[PDB]
Amino acid sequence: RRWFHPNITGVEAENLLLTRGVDGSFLARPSKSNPGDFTLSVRRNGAVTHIKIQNTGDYYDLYGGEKFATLAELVQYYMEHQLKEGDVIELKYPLNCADPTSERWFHGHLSGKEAEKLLTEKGKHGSFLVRESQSHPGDFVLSVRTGDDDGKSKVTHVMIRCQELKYDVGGGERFDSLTDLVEHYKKNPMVETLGTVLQLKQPLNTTRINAAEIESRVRELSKQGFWEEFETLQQQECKLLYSRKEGQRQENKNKNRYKNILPFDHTRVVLHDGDPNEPVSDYINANIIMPEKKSYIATQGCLQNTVNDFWRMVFQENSRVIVMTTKEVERGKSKCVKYWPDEYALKEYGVMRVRNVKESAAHDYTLRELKLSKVGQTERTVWQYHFRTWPDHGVPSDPGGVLDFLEEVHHKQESIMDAGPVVVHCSAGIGRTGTFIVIDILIDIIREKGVDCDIDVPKTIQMVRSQRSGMVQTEAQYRFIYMAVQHYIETLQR
Ligand SMILES: Cn1cc2c(Cl)c(-c3c[nH]c4nc(N5[C@@H]6CC[C@H]5C[C@@H](N)C6)cnc34)ccc2n1
Numbered sequence: 261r262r263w264f265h266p267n268i269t270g271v272e273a274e275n276l277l278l279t280r281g282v283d284g285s286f287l288a289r290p291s292k293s294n295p296g297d298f299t300l301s302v303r304r305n306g307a308v309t310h311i312k313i314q315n316t317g318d319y320y321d322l323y324g325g326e327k328f329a330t331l332a333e334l335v336q337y338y339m340e341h342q343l344k345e346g347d348v349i350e351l352k353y354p355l356n357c358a359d360p361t362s363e364r365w366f367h368g369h370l371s372g373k374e375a376e377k378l379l380t381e382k383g384k385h386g387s388f389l390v391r392e393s394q395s396h397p398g399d400f401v402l403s404v405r406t407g408d409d410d411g412k413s414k415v416t417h418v419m420i421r422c423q424e425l426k427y428d429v430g431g432g433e434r435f436d437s438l439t440d441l442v443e444h445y446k447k448n449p450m451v452e453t454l455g456t457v458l459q460l461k462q463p464l465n466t467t468r469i470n471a472a473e474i475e476s477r478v479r480e481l482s483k484q485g486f487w488e489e490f491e492t493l494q495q496q497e498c499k500l501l502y503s504r505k506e507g508q509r510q511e512n513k514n515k516n517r518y519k520n521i522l523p524f525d526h527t528r529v530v531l532h533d534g535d536p537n538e539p540v541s542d543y544i545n546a547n548i549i550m551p552e553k554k555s556y557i558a559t560q561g562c563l564q565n566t567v568n569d570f571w572r573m574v575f576q577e578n579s580r581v582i583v584m585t586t587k588e589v590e591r592g593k594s595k596c597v598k599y600w601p602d603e604y605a606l607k608e609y610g611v612m613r614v615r616n617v618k619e620s621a622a623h624d625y626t627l628r629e630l631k632l633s634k635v636g637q638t639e640r641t642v643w644q645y646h647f648r649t650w651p652d653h654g655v656p657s658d659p660g661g662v663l664d665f666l667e668e669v670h671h672k673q674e675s676i677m678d679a680g681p682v683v684v685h686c687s688a689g690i691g692r693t694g695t696f697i698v699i700d701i702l703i704d705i706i707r708e709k710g711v712d713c714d715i716d717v718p719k720t721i722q723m724v725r726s727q728r729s730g731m732v733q734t735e736a737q738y739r740f741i742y743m744a745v746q747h748y749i750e751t752l753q754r
Pocket of ligand 1: 361362363364365366367466467488489490491492493494496716718719722
């Protein structure tokens with residue numbers, strides 16, 4: 261993902277493309293002044309075009325292009341394909357960024373003893389970091405722990421010289437960036453004169469906190485670090501380009517809200533017992549999310565033609581609780597089509613039958629008590645929690661309403677013996693959906709253990725993002741997750 265440049269200006273972008281690129285060269289970059297705006301900058305015919313990519317919380321919307329779950333999936337699509345102003349714009353040659361500050365292992369500011377302490381306390385064999393030299397202004401230091409799991413372990417420091425914007429460990433190959441240097445010694449470890457192999461197995465973990473000390477961390481990230489932690493998470497999304505072939509089948513194209521926002525094959529919900537008189541009846545744009553007790557299905561808002569599939573899914577998976585994350589309509593646009601009957605009414609949805617027994621309004625949500633059964637047979641109650649007050653852009657300014665909602669959703673789920681996964685949906689089913697599920701996982705840990713458990717917010721998101729594309733869309737959602745955790749801890753504290 262070296263084609264993303266976190267700290268580049270528009271003019272820097274043009275200059276790089278003109279001086280270091282050719283026709284078909286391209287890079288992506290943030291706007292500083294605009295929080296979820298991105299720019300795809302592309303060279304064509306000796307000039308540079310800039311293409312806006314907007315993300316308000318639900319998807320990356322490329323101007324004159326499609327909607328995507330991640331910038332990595334966006335770039336892969338166009339590099340393997342179609343993008344137009346109405347002339348075609350080709351993405352051929354990624355223009356690679358040398359900037360180290362979005363790498364997990366980069367801690368510019370760290371001193372020598374502080375890096376030793378951190379590796380001593382948090383680190384294990386093969387834990388490493390790169391820091392700026394304090395003794396040699398402009399050089400870097402590689403600091404690596406090796407040993408058993410005393411004096412059976414040690415920290416080694418390797419000096420990294422910077423000569424003419426190339427990095428080296430004192431001999432051999434000179435690398436054009438610290439990333440290229442680290443990737444080379446990750447793959448081909450340095451061996452000390454006396455045998456020790458300085459293996460670079462994992463970056464030092466600096467994001468795992470004890471839950472009690474959330475307020476400390478939020479304060480620090482608020483000085484921001486929030487943006488820096490988030491971009492470092494985003495850099496890792498290139499590890500998550502898993503196959504989505506079932507969703508790409510012609511038979512399944514019009515079962516997807518957005519043609520290119522698709523379920524990973526390895527976690528998609530497979531529907532059995534379908535209409536035998538219809539070719540592909542096993543597909544819904546939905547994934548199982550298994551925290552790595554309570555599981556989830558993350559899915560899109562229904563289309564007219566997928567409402568029947570949605571109820572087949574709820575019934576098959578034994579789900580008893582549905583969370584809806586959007587109004588039916590927002591900004592005059594359909595965000596989640598109505599798939600339930602009016603209050604007191606009864607409807608058939610293919611082979612499934614649903615009664616709406618009772619609706620109950622709360623401040624931030626409406627609860628619908630639905631009864632689901634198969635025609636001709638099986639009845640169970642499905643409790644649908646329809647969150648109604650999420651703003652149309654951005655995130656809520658206070659997390660109390662979301663937390664009070666998830667607390668109630670949690671207790672409903674826990675009250676029903678052997679209930680299946682909690683269904684969480686609407687819109688594309690990645691942004692708000694991913695935000696609600698992550699908050700839910702984190703608060704669950706804390707509810708079971710207490711204020712003195714360890715959480716790792718970015719680790720948790722990456723784990724959920726490995727099970728559905730782009731779960732948690734924006735920096736604002738990312739910040740909102742930390743705020744919700746912070747707030748939960750305070751209400752529990754006393
Ligand atoms: C499997 N897995 C993936 C993970 C990722 Cl992506 C992170 C993570 C996200 N953002 C970070 N920011 C970090 N920080 C700031 C400040 C210093 C350090 C480095 C970088 N300069 C940004 C560290 N880890 C992270 C943490 C745990 C993970 N587990």
